[PDB]
Design a binder for this molecule. Structure first.
Ligand SMILES: [Zn+2]
Ligand SMILES: [Zn+2]
Lengths: 385, 141, 242, 186, 78
């Protein structure tokens, strides 16, 4: 059965059908209303419980098989005043000294050495992107009716690793994560990718730098595919698209290269519901013929009324790692726009140049080529990340 | 990540004391909570992101303490801990407990057992959490 | 876990990847560069020392090979020739070659290194002395423009900086090979440009301009989420920042 | 099977067969004339020759491969004494390298010498004759034996008729030990 | 050490009957008995003479019992 379980502790889980998983979840929630995207009543102090008592006590009595008086006593006993050690007017910026928490002791030890004139700041804690995105999207609703999340829709958290890999660290990975809906097709996710490889350009133009190519790689090549459970999902919507998976299949199945038999399908043929996929287990996505991304399904859960209900933002980026800009070697401060080879002036090969430095080093006022070198346009993946 | 730097010790101490009281009443848990002042944990110069992650991980750890094989009293204490953590947080919107598919039906069965056991305090607290919809319907906690 | 790093699928027996796809071959024919080409490793002093050793070794082989090959040939001919006068002549040539070998062995390393523009066995150096870890052209450039001793490695004097600033304006901050030649301190175009740009008011602006502000605002509004913005990546679009 | 571009072996390891044989032949001839083959199994020596050849023909990559890797690629078992023969032949190569003007200044080593086998074998005859004036022999005996076949003391004397008699009493059992032997293996 | 002492006790009680000593030893073969003899004789010529003079009782049960006990004790302590 489609019963999720760990394959390795807190690293990855058993495979299951996403559609069956969603149906099993909805079966355990349909008719109760806990899954609905409507705002429910909220707990409050006993001093203001009178208004909600009529609506709540009868339901409590029905569900807990207790009397209405017992429901009222339970509501009185479990009031928030028995737990709110903090008044609603207290600011979160100060540690309350009247506490026995070891956690707040450690927090005090952290804050005490961050109050000197050299250390006092309101700077980043450990990262920024997550809360900015959440506050930008959490709890919002769409401006169009067609852009509304359906009730009980599955939210899938998909990590896509960058093509630029560290090659020196292995604990953390360079990745960006989208939330996607079960009913979405893989075409939408692929079209939502803003990877720099689509912007790749080249060609040798040392003689005529203004003749840079008019077409980015996205305009030249549109091949892209996902790979799950041994199945390739190749895009074929446009004539520039080609079935990259066929070459991989021909190469891999001819020898005991360590992988089993695969099968090819179109990208429009499957929704996220149709996938039988693991959580945490790495998978593959590829585009532009050579740009491979590792795919990790970090999380899957049903939509909740506090979540981002605005479809226009989906696939909704939910985490993003950082890459450094390729600073040109001339000034070593500014970001490069060009790269040269066989350069008679550069101290090293390849050498990176900015749009100013390249032009006013390798050319004169009339634009005539100076010295001997080969030069190519460069788009920085650290910039367009 | 696993756990905050210190939360596990405080949670273990509070749950151990609750168990040692040999009582399941919510009154005793609230007395311990107010004596030790657990609710203050969500103050202390935590920025919104720090607060969101801290609430997520605290709720996850409390859910781990709430699941079996822990016995009746300790599970009840962990449910009270979950309730306190969720309802004393300062997030906007409120952060939810991560609940797995393999755990939701077991927790509903525990709610039914609590109702059958005539210990309505824990069942009411869980129903109040459901009214707050404190639970995310995830695959893992 | 970590096995799935790019390339995601890799051969279990030999570690090779798939053959070049048609899209990749067509990209290569168009000359579209890959992101893996931007990986550059800094030159450690150990690499510089090994390069000095490799260049002096190459020059030493180049000087010795003629002399010792002639010595060996003369010794062969002496062994196979029975004529006494010819044997003595061949022995004399062998002794002369031996003395020349000894003289070359006694030459200092500075003489062996020779001039900046002298010829070297660059591709052999790259592929046999460094096992191909750095390309032949890369090694050639690094040596001839930074490592060879005739390059002016000395720190910039204040008079040198002031003259560089003054003379750059005459040429329009342009044609830096001629600027470096006219400066008269044996600097290169790249060194002069690097020094100028690191101390250039026109590059490292303190003021602002209308188009910079407009386009900065445009990129910020496009890409900002909440309190986060791409501070140092917007530097790509507007010129003259870090 | 290195000479075929089979999928099992990377094409990087493929090479022309004729020059393979010429290099192997000259290495084996060097081993033969340098005393390595007499009284010893030739197969390990030929294995070492082929391996140093395969390394020396592409130092850039094949210098990083070990004999286990090469034999795995070839699907040929490697004799255990092949490693010792390879070490001895590399020692011979270092003894040859000490004469050449450039090699002796470059201060080579066991691993680096493999990229000069070409010019070492180009001028083999003169260098090996000069080195022989420094021969090769089993290292077990080359440890500078001060004494060689010492003359033992003369002990051909046999006495007159009997030099001793208590030995016979020493070599016979008492009734106790006689009975003990009877019961030892009963 | 104790193996050599037992071997010396055996040469005392039974003489240079290498076959029976090999048979009573748990594992040692005849060739090993000969090799031990060749190695020890140089420094223990006096001790083998003492053994030949020391015609100690070669009882079966007693020798088996002390063999087993001392072997077990050495194996435990080593
Ligand atoms: Zn990409
Ligand atoms: Zn510049």
């Amino acid at each position: 059965c489609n019963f999720p379980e760990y394959e390795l502790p807190e690293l990855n889980t058993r495979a299951f059908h996403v559609g069956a998983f969603g149906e099993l979840w909805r079966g355990r929630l349909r008719g109760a209303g806990d899954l609905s995207l409507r705002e429910p009543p909220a707990s409050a102090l006993p001093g203001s419980q009178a208004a909600d008592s009529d609506r709540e006590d009868a339901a409590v009595a029905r569900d807990l098989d207790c009397s209405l008086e017992a429901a009222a006593e339970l509501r009185a006993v479990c009031g928030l005043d028995k737990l709110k050690c903090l008044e609603d007017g207290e600011d979160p910026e100060v540690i309350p000294e009247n506490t026995d928490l070891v956690t707040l002791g450690v927090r005090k030890r952290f804050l005490e050495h961050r109050e000197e004139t050299i250390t006092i700041d309101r700077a980043c804690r450990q990262e920024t992107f997550v809360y900015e995105m959440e506050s930008h999207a959490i709890g919002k609703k769409p401006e169009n009716s067609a852009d509304m999340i359906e009730e009980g829709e599955l939210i899938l958290s998909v990590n896509i690793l960058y093509p630029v890999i560290f090659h020196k660290h292995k604990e953390h990975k360079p990745y960006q994560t989208m939330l996607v809906l079960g009913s979405q097709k893989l075409t939408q996710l692929r079209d939502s990718i803003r990877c720099v490889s689509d912007l790749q350009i080249g060609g040798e133009f040392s003689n005529t730098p203004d003749q840079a190519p008019e077409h980015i790689s996205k305009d030249l090549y549109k091949s892209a595919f996902f790979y799950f459970e041994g199945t390739f999902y190749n895009d074929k919507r446009y004539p520039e698209c080609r079935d990259l998976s066929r070459t991989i299949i021909e190469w891999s199945e001819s020898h005991d290269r360590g992988y089993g038999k695969f099968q090819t399908a179109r990208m429009e043929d499957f929704t996220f519901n149709d996938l039988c996929i693991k959580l945490g287990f790495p998978y593959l996505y590829c585009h532009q013929g050579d740009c491979e991304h590792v795919i990790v399904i970090t999380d899957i859960r049903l939509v909740h009324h506090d979540d981002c209900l605005d479809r226009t933002l989906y696939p909704l980026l939910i985490k993003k790692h950082w890459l450094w800009t390729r600073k040109c070697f001339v000034c070593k401060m500014y970001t490069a726009r060009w790269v040269t080879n066989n350069d008679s002036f550069a101290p090293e090969d390849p050498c990176f140049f900015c749009d100013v430095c390249f032009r006013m080093l390798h050319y004169d006022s009339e634009g005539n080529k100076l010295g001997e070198f080969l030069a190519y346009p460069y788009v920085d993946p650290g910039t367009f990340n | 990540m696993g756990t905050p730097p210190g939360l596990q010790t405080d949670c273990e101490a509070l749950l151990s004391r609750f168990q040692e009281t040999d009582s399941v009443r919510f009154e005793d848990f609230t007395e311990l909570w107010r004596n030790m002042k657990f609710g203050t944990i969500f103050c202390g110069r935590m920025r919104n992101l720090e607060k969101n992650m801290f609430t997520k991980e605290a709720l996850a750890l409390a859910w781990r303490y709430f699941l079996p094989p822990y016995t009746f009293q300790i599970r009840v204490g962990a449910l009270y801990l979950l309730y306190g953590l969720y309802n004393t947080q300062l997030c906007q919107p409120k952060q939810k407990i991560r609940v797995a598919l393999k755990d939701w039906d077991e927790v509903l069965k525990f709610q039914q057992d609590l109702v059958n056991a005539q210990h309505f305090d824990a069942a009411y607290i869980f129903r109040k959490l459901r009214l707050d919809r404190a639970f995310h319907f995830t695959a893992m906690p | 876990m970590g096995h799935f790093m790019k390339p995601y699928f890799k051969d279990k027996v030999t570690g090779v990847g798939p053959p070049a796809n048609e899209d990749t071959r067509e990209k290569a024919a168009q000359g579209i560069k890959a992101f893996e080409e931007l990986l550059v490793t800094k030159w450690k002093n150990w690499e510089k020392a090994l390069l000095r050793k490799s260049v002096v070794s190459d020059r030493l082989q180049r000087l010795l090979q003629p002399k010792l090959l002639k010595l060996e040939y003369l010794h062969q001919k002496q062994s196979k020739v029975s004529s006494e006068l010819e044997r003595q002549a061949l022995e004399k040539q062998g002794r002369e070659a031996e003395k020349e070998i000894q003289d070359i062995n006694q030459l200092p390393e500075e003489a062996l290194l020779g001039n900046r523009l002298d010829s070297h066995d660059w591709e052999k150096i790259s592929n046999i002395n460094f096992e191909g870890s750095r390309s032949a052209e890369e090694i050639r450039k690094f040596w001839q423009n930074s490592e060879h001793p005739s390059i002016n490695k000395q720190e910039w004097s204040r008079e040198e900086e002031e003259r560089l600033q003054a003379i750059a304006a005459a040429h329009g901050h342009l044609e830096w090979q001629k600027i470096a030649e006219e400066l008269g301190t044996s600097r290169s175009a790249f060194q002069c440009l690097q020094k100028f740009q690191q101390h250039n008011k026109a590059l490292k602006r303190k003021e602002w301009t209308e188009e910079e502000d407009r386009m900065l605002t445009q990129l910020v509004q496009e890409m900002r989420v909440g309190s986060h913005i791409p501070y140092r990546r917007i530097v790509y679009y507007m010129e003259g920042r870090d | 099977k290195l000479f075929q571009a089979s999928p099992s072996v990377p094409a990087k390891y493929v090479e022309d067969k004729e020059k393979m044989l010429s290099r192997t032949m000259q290495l084996v001839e060097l081993a033969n004339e340098t005393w390595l083959v007499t009284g010893r199994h030739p197969l390990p020596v030929i294995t070492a020759a082929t391996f140093l050849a395969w390394q020396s023909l592409q130092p850039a990559d094949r210098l990083s491969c070990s004999l286990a890797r090469f034999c795995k690629l070839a699907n040929v078992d490697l004799p255990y004494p092949a490693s010792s023969r390879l070490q001895e032949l590399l020692a011979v190569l270092l003894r040859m390298a000490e004469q050449l003007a450039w090699l002796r200044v470059l201060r080579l080593d066991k691993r680096s010498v493999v990229k000069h086998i070409g010019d070492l074998l180009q001028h083999r005859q003169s260098l090996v004759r000069s080195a022989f004036r420094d021969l090769l022999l089993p290292p077990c005996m080359l440890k500078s034996p001060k004494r060689i076949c010492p003359v033992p003391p003369v002990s051909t004397v046999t006495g007159d008729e009997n030099i001793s008699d208590s030995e016979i009493e020493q070599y016979l059992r008492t009734p106790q030990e006689v009975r003990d032997f009877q019961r030892a293996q009963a | 050490n104790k193996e050599t002492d037992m071997f010396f006790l055996a040469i005392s009680m039974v003489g240079t009957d290498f076959s029976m000593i090999g048979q009573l030893f748990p594992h040692r073969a005849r060739i090993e008995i000969k090799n031990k003899f060749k190695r020890e004789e140089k420094t223990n010529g006096w001790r083998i003479d003492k053994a030949f003079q020391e015609k100690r009782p070669f009882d079966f049960d007693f020798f088996a019992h002390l063999l087993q006990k001392v072997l077990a004790e050495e194996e435990k302590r080593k």
